[PDB]
Structure 1
Amino acid sequence: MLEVCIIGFGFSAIPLVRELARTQTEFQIISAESGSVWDRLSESGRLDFSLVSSFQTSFYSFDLVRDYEKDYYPTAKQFYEMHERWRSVYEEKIIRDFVTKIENFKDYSLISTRSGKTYEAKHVVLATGFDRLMNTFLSNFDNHVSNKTFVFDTMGDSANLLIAKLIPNNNKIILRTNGFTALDQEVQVLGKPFTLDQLESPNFRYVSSELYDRLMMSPVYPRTVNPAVSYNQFPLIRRDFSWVDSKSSPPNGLIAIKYWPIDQYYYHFNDDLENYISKGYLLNDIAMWLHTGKVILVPSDTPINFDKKTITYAGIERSFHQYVKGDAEQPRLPTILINGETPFEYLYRDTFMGVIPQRLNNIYFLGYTRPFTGGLANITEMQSLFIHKLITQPQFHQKIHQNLSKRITAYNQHYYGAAKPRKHDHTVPFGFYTEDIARLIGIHYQPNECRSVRDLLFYYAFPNNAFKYRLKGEYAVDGVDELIQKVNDKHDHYAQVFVQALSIRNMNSDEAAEWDHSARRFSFNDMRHKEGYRAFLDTYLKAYRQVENISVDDTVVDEEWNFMVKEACQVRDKVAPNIEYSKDEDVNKGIRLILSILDSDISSLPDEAQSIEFIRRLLQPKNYELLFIR
């Protein structure tokens, strides 16, 4: 009898397959001849974009320990090429077939395929990915279309990439939506670029949820009246967050689009523009789009007639080429029959950690948890270790399964509270989720075991990437020690984010919100760093056009657009003139102090002032309890 059957092989299954091979656990892989989105993109020649996520968080530890030399954003092509190298390694283990049904019994499953071949497996892993409605617009939709109006109903990473490809052909973009959360994928810290995922210091939640909340949420919730922030210049981008019923911030179920702010795009690519664009580094600055009016927001309830293909805003009945419904995404599960008979119904909240479903035996879900920021690799790598330990160690299987029902209840209380199930429940802050899996497995770190200030930085400030937990113990990866030193050496041991937490320990929500926005350039949606980039933007559009052999005339005028843009940008034409310290000042001093006491013993530190008292209490954080683990 087959010990393990993995269904679907793309990206998510790689780490688990690796661990099963290591313990010589008997496994077979079944995966469709047709492959995935990435093969459609490959063969239609549309691997012509880059990831929104850092190398550090998008490629697995066993690759990073060989190939990390610096932070960069991988291209679509580099991501697919990495899928194809790992497929080649394991191709002998893969049956090319399509699973149509799983019949789940007490300690085994009967798997049906389209060939009609049947397989019996004690443990079954689904790593089948998602059906995504937007994939067609990326796969197929045309790059010649020009000067048309498009209406999007929702704003996600796919819509934002499509908008990036549309804008250089003078296509006009209308977002009719109930707000969206966008974040600069990169932040300049004392002149050095940090991806946003490197600045979240998530283990500060254990100190207090209130402190973690005021440190993180001012770019998301409208807490500052600083007139430089997009959610003040363009109030329509604001969301209804009344659904949120949890002390854990940022909450599970929050989604953001991550985008290149034009200032950082310039710093990276100005020097060799066309060649960078040709590689898939595309400018997707939604905030620069709202600034220059190439995108406009209109109310959620703005009247639209699909019969005549017109939207009614600014007293103008406006004609559009295409309405884009908006990315719904569904896990590609085959029919699963409970005890051979009753169809299983998938709901994220009814699985433990997005992996273990109820009323099924020895069936695990790999790849159906989405990270709030950073790449999927961090999530799937930790899920792979969790599944590996559940499949190979019966004691661990029993320990998790015995009280599965109450772990799930305790998880849902902590992270969702009394909120109704939502379609984005599957979205988790990466640094909570990786840490949660690490504590479940026992490869986590103990704050009490920190000895030096250096150790405290590693524990609190070093990002909770999967490879953080493969330094030592049960799932150690060779070379992770040198990886961490490289990453620490390049990011000043994450002293800046440690200092951020220190700066707001004694503030309230509102004070923290003002402080986070006092910078010359604050991290997210800073509308002061747009105007001075218009010259660069034309160099960009021209370079893009040259790359894609496009002709277009920038003298054509859509006076109806102008009335709608000016109607749209009314609040901005009021607020932006009100524009015009602390964060820049506090960071620069804090970092000097911290770097000075790096190798100082914590326990020994004497009685600036209560910042030492605070640093000492980090050995004994008061909000460490996670009842889905304990």
Structure 2
Amino acid sequence: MLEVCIIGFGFSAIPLVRELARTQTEFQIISAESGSVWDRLSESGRLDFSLVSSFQTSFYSFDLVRDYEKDYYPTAKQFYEMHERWRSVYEEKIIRDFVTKIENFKDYSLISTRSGKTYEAKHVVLATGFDRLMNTFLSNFDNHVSNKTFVFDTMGDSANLLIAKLIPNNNKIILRTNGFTALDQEVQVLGKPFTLDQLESPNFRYVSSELYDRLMMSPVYPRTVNPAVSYNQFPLIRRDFSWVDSKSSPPNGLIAIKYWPIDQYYYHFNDDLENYISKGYLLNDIAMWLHTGKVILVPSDTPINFDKKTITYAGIERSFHQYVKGDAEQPRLPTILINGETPFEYLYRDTFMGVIPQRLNNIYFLGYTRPFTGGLANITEMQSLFIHKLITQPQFHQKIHQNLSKRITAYNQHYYGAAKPRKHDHTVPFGFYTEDIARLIGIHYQPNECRSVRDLLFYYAFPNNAFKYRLKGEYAVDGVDELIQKVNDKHDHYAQVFVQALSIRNMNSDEAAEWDHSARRFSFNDMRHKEGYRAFLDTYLKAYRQVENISVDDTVVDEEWNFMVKEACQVRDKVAPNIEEKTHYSKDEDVNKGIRLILSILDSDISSLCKFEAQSIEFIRRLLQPKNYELLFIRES
């Protein structure tokens, strides 16, 4: 009897196969000869973009311990080459066939394949990925189209990538929108660059869900009246968040687009633009597109005549060249039969942690949970440890399964409340999910075991990447000690993030929203740092066209478009003139002050510790006994 069968080998399965090989657990992989989108993109020479996720959250711990030297955003090519490197290590373990059906019984499954062969296995792991409509569109996109108008009914990372490829050829973009959430993928902290995933300090939720909400959600919800933020200059960007019913913020089910702000793009790539573009580093600053009018937002009910290919807005019947509507990703699951008779219906909220479907036995799903920020690696690495322990330790399997339905019910009450199941339920804050798995497995850290301020910085402020939980214990990886030390030294031990939570501890949500936007450059969608980059943008467009070997006529003035832009930016034109220079910027000052205190007490025992220093030490001491630490779905009762 085959112990483990893994169906699908791309990226999500790598960490599980590593752990199964380590324990010499019998396993067999079955993965299709076709491959993944990355294979198709590679064969067509379309790996010409970059990840929207940081290196430290997008590659696995056992690679980072060898290759991590700085924070950066990998290219699609680098990502695919890592997929291939690991495929080559385990190819001998891969049967190249396509699973068509899985018959599930009480203690084993019967696996059917297109070739006609059948397999039996006690444990079956699905890591088959998702089908996505936009994938084929990106695979067939002619990036030389020029001087055309495009209408988008959906916004997302894939749409934003297409928009980044259309903008340089003088194409005009109309977003027919009911809002979207976009976030600078890299931000300045006291002028220093930080990927957004580095500044989430998720474990502060344990201090207070309200405190963590104040600290995180002002860039998403319209909480500040600051005229420099994009959702006040372009109100059509605001989404209807009436569905949210959980007290855990950021809520499960929230999705965001991560993009290069032009000021950080300039900082990294200005000295070698053509090469960086050719490597896949494309400027996709949606806020800059709105600022310059190259993209406009129009109401969702703006009428479209699909026969005549026109859209009517601002009293203008505007011809358009192409309409783009993305679809919903759907899991690539084969037929699964409960008790070998009843077809299984996949529902994220009816699985535990996105991994254990409670209607099946010894079947696990790997790679179907999506991170709100950061790369999938954080999620699939922790899922792989979870699945590995379930497969190889019967006592853990029983501890989790004995009260499975009760665990799922408690999880859904905590993260979704009374909200009805949504399409995006499978999206989770990565620092909540990794910490949830760590506590289930037992490789978590305990806040009450911190002894020094430095220990508290590590517990609360050091990002909950998967490798954080692989320094000690059951799933320890050699070299993680040096990795953690390097990450700490290059991030000032995450004191700046720790200080943020400290600065807003006594504020309400409105006061926190204003404080988060009181910096000279606040983290997300700061419209004060766009106009100064118009000249660089022209330089960038010239470089992009040279790379793609296209000539574009930028002489013809599109008066019609200028008219539509003026209509679409009426609010911006009323709001932006209210921006005022200030003498002091509270967030910049409070952070600078806090960092000086923390580093002055870094190696001090927590028990040994004007007024700000006194009140801050008091808050720090309470961090040893957080009052919101309970997660009911962790218990076995």
So what's the TM-score if we normalise by structure 2? 0.98
Distance 1:141 1:266 in 2: 27
Q: Secondary structure at the match of 1:628?
A: helix
State the shift of 1:315 in Å: 1.3
State the shift of 1:145 in Å: 1.4
Distance 2:105 2:524 in 1: 50
Q: Is the 8 A contact 1:125 1:366 kept in 2?
A: yes
Deviations 1:333-392 (A, max 9, x none): 001000000000001001000000022000000000000000000000000000000000
Distance 2:381 2:65 in 1: 14
Deviations 1:395-442 (A, max 9, x none): 000000000001000000000000011100000000000000000000
Which residue among 583, 588, 596 is the counterpart of 1:584? 588
Deviations 1:469-510 (A, max 9, x none): 001000000000000000000000000000000000000000
Q: Is the 8 A contact 1:158 1:327 kept in 2?
A: no
Distance 1:589 1:64 in 2: 33
Q: Is the 8 A contact 1:225 1:232 kept in 2?
A: yes
State the shift of 1:308 in Å: 2.1
Distance 2:556 2:108 in 1: 66
State the shift of 1:101 in Å: 0.5
Deviations 1:23-46 (A, max 9, x none): 000000000001000011101000
The answer to whether the aligner puts 1:340 opposite 2:340 as a matched pair is: yes
Distance 2:404 2:320 in 1: 51
The answer for the alignment partner of 1:275 in structure 2 is 275
State the shift of 1:603 in Å: 2.1
Deviations 1:140-160 (A, max 9, x none): 111121111111111110000
Q: Is the 8 A contact 1:205 1:623 kept in 2?
A: yes
Q: Secondary structure at the match of 1:391?
A: helix
The answer for the alignment partner of 1:626 in structure 2 is 631
Distance 2:557 2:347 in 1: 49
State the shift of 1:609 in Å: 2.4
The answer to whether the aligner puts 1:171 opposite 2:171 as a matched pair is: yes
The answer for the alignment partner of 1:616 in structure 2 is 621
State the shift of 1:611 in Å: 1.6
Which sits farther off after the overlay, 578-587 or 457-466?
578-587
Deviations 1:219-258 (A, max 9, x none): 0000000000000000000000000001000000000000
Q: Is the 8 A contact 1:137 1:162 kept in 2?
A: no
Q: Secondary structure at the match of 2:632?
A: coil
Q: Is the 8 A contact 1:7 1:31 kept in 2?
A: yes
Q: Any residues of structure 2 matched to 1:534-549 within 5 Å, and which?
A: 534-549=534-549
Q: Secondary structure at the match of 1:49?
A: coil
RMSD: 0.8
Distance 2:577 2:359 in 1: 60
Which sits farther off after the overlay, 500-509 or 187-196?
187-196
Q: Is the 8 A contact 1:104 1:360 kept in 2?
A: yes
Q: Is the 8 A contact 1:31 1:97 kept in 2?
A: yes
Distance 1:557 1:28 in 2: 62
State the shift of 1:569 in Å: 0.7
Distance 2:307 2:535 in 1: 41
Distance 1:297 1:390 in 2: 48
Distance 2:187 2:143 in 1: 31
Q: Secondary structure at the match of 1:33?
A: coil
State the shift of 1:307 in Å: 2.2
Distance 1:322 1:102 in 2: 41
Distance 1:45 1:117 in 2: 35
State the shift of 1:305 in Å: 2.0
Number of aligned positions between the proteins: 628
Q: Is the 8 A contact 1:2 1:27 kept in 2?
A: yes
State the shift of 1:171 in Å: 1.0
State the shift of 1:327 in Å: 3.5
Which sits farther off after the overlay, 321-330 or 57-66?
321-330
State the shift of 1:189 in Å: 1.2
Question: Deviating runs (4+, > 3 A) in structure 1?
Answer: none
Which sits farther off after the overlay, 610-619 or 464-473?
610-619
Which sits farther off after the overlay, 387-396 or 303-312?
303-312
Q: Percent identity?
A: 100
Distance 2:487 2:317 in 1: 54
Q: Is the 8 A contact 1:156 1:327 kept in 2?
A: no
Q: Secondary structure at the match of 2:311?
A: strand
Distance 2:235 2:585 in 1: 25
Deviations 1:166-200 (A, max 9, x none): 11111111111110000000011122210000000
Q: Any residues of structure 2 matched to 1:384-395 within 5 Å, and which?
A: 384-395=384-395
Distance 1:569 1:407 in 2: 49
Distance 1:247 1:625 in 2: 13
Q: Is the 8 A contact 1:57 1:376 kept in 2?
A: yes
The answer for the alignment partner of 1:532 in structure 2 is 532
Which residue among 571, 588, 606 is the counterpart of 1:602? 606
Distance 2:418 2:312 in 1: 38
State the shift of 1:312 in Å: 1.6
Deviations 1:83-120 (A, max 9, x none): 00000000000000000100001000111111010000
State the shift of 1:302 in Å: 1.1
State the shift of 1:66 in Å: 0.2
Q: Any residues of structure 2 matched to 1:201-600 within 5 Å, and which?
A: 201-579=201-579, 581-600=585-604
Distance 2:201 2:7 in 1: 35
Q: Is the 8 A contact 1:274 1:543 kept in 2?
A: yes
Q: Secondary structure at the match of 2:405?
A: helix
Distance 2:346 2:308 in 1: 39
Distance 2:319 2:361 in 1: 54
Distance 2:324 2:350 in 1: 31
Distance 1:364 1:612 in 2: 45
Distance 1:306 1:348 in 2: 36
Which sits farther off after the overlay, 268-277 or 446-455?
268-277
Q: Is the 8 A contact 1:379 1:433 kept in 2?
A: yes
Distance 2:439 2:338 in 1: 30
Distance 2:58 2:136 in 1: 24
State the shift of 1:301 in Å: 1.3
So what's the TM-score if we normalise by structure 1? 0.99
Q: Is the 8 A contact 1:185 1:258 kept in 2?
A: yes
Distance 1:352 1:315 in 2: 52
Q: Secondary structure at the match of 1:595?
A: helix
Deviations 1:587-625 (A, max 9, x none): 0010000001000001222xx122211110000000000
Q: Secondary structure at the match of 2:563?
A: helix
Q: Secondary structure at the match of 1:500?
A: helix
Distance 1:322 1:436 in 2: 44
**Which ranges in structure 1 are unaligned for 5 or more consecutive residues?**
none
Deviations 1:560-593 (A, max 9, x none): 2111111001100110000091000000010000
Q: Secondary structure at the match of 2:103?
A: strand
Q: Secondary structure at the match of 1:296?
A: strand
**Which ranges in structure 2 are unaligned for 5 or more consecutive residues?**
none
Distance 1:316 1:7 in 2: 53
Distance 2:328 2:141 in 1: 18
Q: Secondary structure at the match of 2:472?
A: coil
Distance 1:529 1:326 in 2: 30
Q: Is the 8 A contact 1:110 1:119 kept in 2?
A: yes
